[PDB]
Structures are given as C-alpha cells and as structure tokens.
Amino acid sequence: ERTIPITRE
Amino acid sequence: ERTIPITRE
Amino acid sequence: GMRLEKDRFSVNLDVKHFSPEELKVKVLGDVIEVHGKHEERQEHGFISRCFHRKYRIPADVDPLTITSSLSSDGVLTVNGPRKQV
Amino acid sequence: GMRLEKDRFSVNLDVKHFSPEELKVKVLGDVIEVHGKHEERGFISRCFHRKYRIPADVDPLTITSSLSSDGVLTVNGPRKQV
Numbered sequence: 001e002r003t004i005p006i007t008r009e
Numbered sequence: 010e011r012t013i014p015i016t017r018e
Numbered sequence: 019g020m021r022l023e024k025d026r027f028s029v030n031l032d033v034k035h036f037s038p039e040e041l042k043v044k045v046l047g048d049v050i051e052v053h054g055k056h057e058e059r060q061e062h063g064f065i066s067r068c069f070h071r072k073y074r075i076p077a078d079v080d081p082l083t084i085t086s087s088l089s090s091d092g093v094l095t096v097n098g099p100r101k102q103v
Numbered sequence: 104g105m106r107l108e109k110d111r112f113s114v115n116l117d118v119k120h121f122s123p124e125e126l127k128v129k130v131l132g133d134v135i136e137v138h139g140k141h142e143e144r145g146f147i148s149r150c151f152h153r154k155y156r157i158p159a160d161v162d163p164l165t166i167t168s169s170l171s172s173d174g175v176l177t178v179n180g181p182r183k184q185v
Binding site (some may be wrong): 061062063064065066067068069070071072073074 | 145146147148152153154155156157
C-alpha cells in the first residue's frame with residue numbers, strides 16, 4: 001500500500 | 010425542463 | 019445555491035455531470051437535501067462520484083409545496099412558495 | 104483516463120474542484136486508486152473515487168503523481184525495460 005505523493009506540476 | 014420527483018421518505 | 023426571496027425560496031445547482039436518474043431531492047420537514055451519485059464499472063475501470071448538499075427551509079414554506087425541475091443545460095432547481103397574504 | 108503505452112502507463116484525471124490536500128493516490132498491488140473528498144459546513148460534500156488496473160510489469164516504487172495548475176492530475180510509471 002504505497003501512498004503516492006502528489007507533487008506540483 | 011424535466012420535472013424531478015421529490016423523495017419524502 | 020440557496021436564495022430566499024420575498025414570496026419564495028429557490029435552490030439552483032449545477033448538476034451537468036449527472037443524469038436525472040442519478041439525482042435525488044429529498045424533502046424531510048424543514049430540510050432539503052440534494053444527492054447525486056454516478057457509478058460505473060468500466061476493463062479495469064471503476065468510477066464513482068457523488069455530491070451532497072443540504073439546506074434548511076424557511077418556516078413559512080409548507081414542505082409539501084416544494085417542487086423541482088432540471089433544465090436541459092443541467093441546472094437543477096428546487097423551489098417553494100412562502101405563505102402569501 | 105488510463106493510457107497503457109509500450110514502456111509506461113499514465114492516468115490523467117480532471118480534478119479542478121479539489122485542492123491538493125483533498126486528493127489521495129494509492130497503489131495497492133496492480134491497482135491504482137485515486138480519491139478526492141471536499142466537505143464544508145449550509146452543507147456541501149463532493150467526492151470521487153477511481154480505480155484502474157495496471158500491468159504486472161510496473162514497479163510500484165517508480166510510480167509518481169503530479170497536479171497541474173489547471174486541475175489535471177497525472178499518475179504515471181515506467182514498465183520494466185530493455
């Protein structure tokens with residue numbers, strides 16, 4: 001269960 | 010316009 | 019949203035991502051709730067989206083007189099008269 | 104939606120009604136999940152949930168996600184190469 005960091009784009 | 014039925018329960 | 023007017027109230031909401039069958043307007047006493055739910059199981063795809071809004075009705079509106087309609091541009095209206103002189 | 108390509112996958116979703124803190128992306132095995140939830144209290148709630156299956160040759164550790172200023176969320180990752 002990897003929570004994935006939502007980065008700026 | 011379409012009439013939208015109202016749920017009253 | 020909700021507008022109180024002199025002789026009525028009016029709720030207007032954008033619901034263009036929902037089909038009429040996916041909408042529910044509930045009037046229970048002095049509360050109006052509007053719900054929309056769209057679910058589909060697309061090979062991998064599952065998609066769900068929902069909204070909920072609740073508003074309080076003014077005391078001089080008979081909740082049984084409240085009605086609702088959906089415009090072709092996807093604006094849902096819920097309104098009701100206030101008691102008049 | 105989901106696009107499988109030869110050397111990668113990418114999911115692109117419109118999320119313009121959600122701020123970053125209202126969004127979450129998860130990988131569980133070969134499933135990608137994306138959730139958005141916005142509530143405020145005179146009560147407004149909106150949410151969405153999407154799930155996609157990804158091919159088994161994607162290393163979950165290389166999966167990344169970013170949110171464009173126009174409200175497009177991307178989730179992508181390479182597939183094993185060479």
